[PDB]
Amino acid sequence: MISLIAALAVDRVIGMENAMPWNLPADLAWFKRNTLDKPVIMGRHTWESIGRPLPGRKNIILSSQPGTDDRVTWVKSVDEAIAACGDVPEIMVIGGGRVYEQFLPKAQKLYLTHIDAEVEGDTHFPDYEPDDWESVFSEFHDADAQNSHSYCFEILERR
Ligand SMILES: Nc1nc(N)c2c(Sc3ccc(Cl)cc3)cccc2n1
Ligand SMILES: [Ca+2]
Ligand SMILES: [Ca+2]
Ligand SMILES: [Ca+2]
């Protein structure tokens, strides 16, 4: 199945100038745990910001243009990105904004980190219909010495 995984601050803001503003190591550990040993699909902008492939995951990059790095799998359409994953139990869509938008209708699961942070952003997570999704997991955490914001990991499944 297709899943999207994203970290959302106030107003569904996901990014600004191709970087996540906030410092949330607990979200980095949640992201790693839910993505490890699964193919990851990302947009070209997200690919450039990471610099190196995510290890122990097949890295699929969405770009209209020819690929510029042989360490990753390059595709030119949503359907090509899915087909390049082959037969796997779950496909992780990691962003960014435009990629989330396109994969949302095809997705069965959403792994959302809701961050209680006011951030200026130029990129937002899609405006998903809440009636279409069922929250099956929801774990709130207060801010601590390592995480400067309170945050909630949520798992939603398409009804
Ligand atoms: N919970 C969560 N979700 C992601 N998708 C993460 C990523 S990669 C990424 C960032 C923004 C967007 Cl839109 C997509 C992927 C990196 C580091 C931590 C991340 N944490
Ligand atoms: Ca490995
Ligand atoms: Ca739909
Ligand atoms: Ca805060």
UniProtKB/Swiss-Prot annotation:
Gene Ontology cellular component terms for the protein in this record: cytosol
SUPFAM superfamilies in alphabetical order: Dihydrofolate reductase-like
Outcome (variant: residue 30 to G): In strain: 1810
Pfam families per record: DHFR_1
Catalytic activity: (6S)-5,6,7,8-tetrahydrofolate + NADP(+) = 7,8-dihydrofolate + NADPH + H(+)
PANTHER family on file: DIHYDROFOLATE REDUCTASE
Name assigned to this protein: Dihydrofolate reductase
